[PDB]
């Protein structure tokens, strides 16, 4: 229920090396399935998940041509931005493209995205209506005028409303064995004494998919919005994810702390406590 | 599949 598709482009200029580096990655939800690198010996789109490998040669050849044209155009766009900001030809710069579509459990489109950043900072975004541009500064407005004259918004909208949703539903069908299954987190609590009167309680959620998860700690019955250290979700490396949350606790009151885990694969929201061995 | 565009800014 409710899926998404995303393409991420990164272009880094290399003034000591002529042409820039272009990398593209494609994701269905939290599963990457394609990749492209302009630095390869023979740059082509490559598969990164099994359920995409069944596509025929025309798919790969067409997408490879797409990426090559995109890389050239991004080189020219980086030179354009350098001009816009009156920056020098010595430094290296980064242009990032983000586009994709979020659909619902039915299949209909819920939201589209098509935005761009320059040197890590927001540059220009296609608004939610898919017909208007929000620009960040004056150079972004130069680009906005260029794009309004070329009716770029309509092309973005044609992709987001049409090809994006169709191919996303195709991907969900051909990969439904994994893309629709929600791997629940294997959860456990753990206890390390820091000294003699304090202890750290760590709540562990491992091996879950998708990445979205909520971990909270609660003393007696009240949460810890200031005592709960949270590491950000990290990839296990097998397409599943991990997270933990820890609390400092006075020694001798380790049963007044409950850990609440909420995940899409959990039949109901779950609650654990230190099961001391 | 990626979008069959090469937008320039």
């Amino acid at each position: 229920g409710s899926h998404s598709m995303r393409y991420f482009y990164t272009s880094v200029s290399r003034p000591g090396r002529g042409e820039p580096r272009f990398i593209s990655v494609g994701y269905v939800d939290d599963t990457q399935f394609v990749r492209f690198d302009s630095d390869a010996a023979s740059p082509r789109e490559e598969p990164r998940a099994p359920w995409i490998e069944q596509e025929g040669p025309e798919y790969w050849d067409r997408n490879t041509q797409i990426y090559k044209a995109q890389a050239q155009t991004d080189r020219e766009s980086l030179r354009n931005l350098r001009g816009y900001y009156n920056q020098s030809e010595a430094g290296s710069h980064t242009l990032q493209s983000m586009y994709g579509c979020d659909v619902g459990p039915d299949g209909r489109l819920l939201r589209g995205h098509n935005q761009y950043a320059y040197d890590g900072k927001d540059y220009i975004a296609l608004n939610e209506d898919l017909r208007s541009w929000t620009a960040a500064d004056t150079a972004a407005q130069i680009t906005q005028r260029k794009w309004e004259a070329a009716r770029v918004a309509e092309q973005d909208r044609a992709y987001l409303e049409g090809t994006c949703v169709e191919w996303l539903r195709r991907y969900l069908e051909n990969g439904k064995d994994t893309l629709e299954r929600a791997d629940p987190p294997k959860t456990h609590v753990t206890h390390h004494p820091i000294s003699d009167h304090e202890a750290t309680l760590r709540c562990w959620a491992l091996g879950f998919y998708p990445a979205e998860i909520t971990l909270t700690w609660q003393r007696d019955g009240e949460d810890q919005t200031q005592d709960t250290e949270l590491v950000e979700t990290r990839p296990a490396g097998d397409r599943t994810f991990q997270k933990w949350a820890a609390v400092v606790v006075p020694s001798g009151e380790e049963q007044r702390y409950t850990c609440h885990v909420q995940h899409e694969g959990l039949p109901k929201p779950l609650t654990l406590r230190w099961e001391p061995s | 599949t990626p979008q069959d565009l090469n937008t320039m800014l």
Partner: T-cell receptor
Amino acid sequence: DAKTTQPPSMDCAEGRAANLPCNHSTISGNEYVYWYRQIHSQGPQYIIHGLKNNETNEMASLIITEDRKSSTLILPHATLRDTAVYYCIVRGLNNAGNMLTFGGGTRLMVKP
Amino acid sequence: AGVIQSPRHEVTEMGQEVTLRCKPISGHNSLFWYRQTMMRGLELLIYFNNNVPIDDSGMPEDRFSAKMPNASFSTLKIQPSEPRDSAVYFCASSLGIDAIYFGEGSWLTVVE
């Protein structure tokens, strides 16, 4: 790539209305219908384009059916100048279908 | 001001270099080279978008080279020219998804 069908030839009386049909059964939602004409091998000339709703301008009218599977170019009062080849071309909104691919066209003779 | 093409006429012996030049409508980002003979009707040679070659499958495999160094200049070069290259080469340009506009054409006759 070429996606349209037209009658190879068609006559019309000068001063009368010329109805040039076109079939594009396989058209897609985000594809436009364009109409060009060519006179004496000169450069093809844009006439009109449309998406779904009827369109009219200072050269012709474009009538697209409800199911968008066929259309008609209407010259109102055809003159002798309008004797030419008329191409009905589908044009998409991405790089794959951004270019015009010319089919047979309809060779329109305006006879006085 | 429309699309500007040069030369308008060229009659030259075979075996030498032919260069056709095109200035698109200023502000346009898309450029097309088409060719017209009697046999084939109107064929796309090359499609540039933002000076990047997007589609060149219509390019002959040898002696034909298309080039866009900037958004206001494009060349098509034939070397060496052969009689089978005789045709009318049209340059067209477009702003975004607006209508594509054609130049007046370059009529090349390569004589044996």
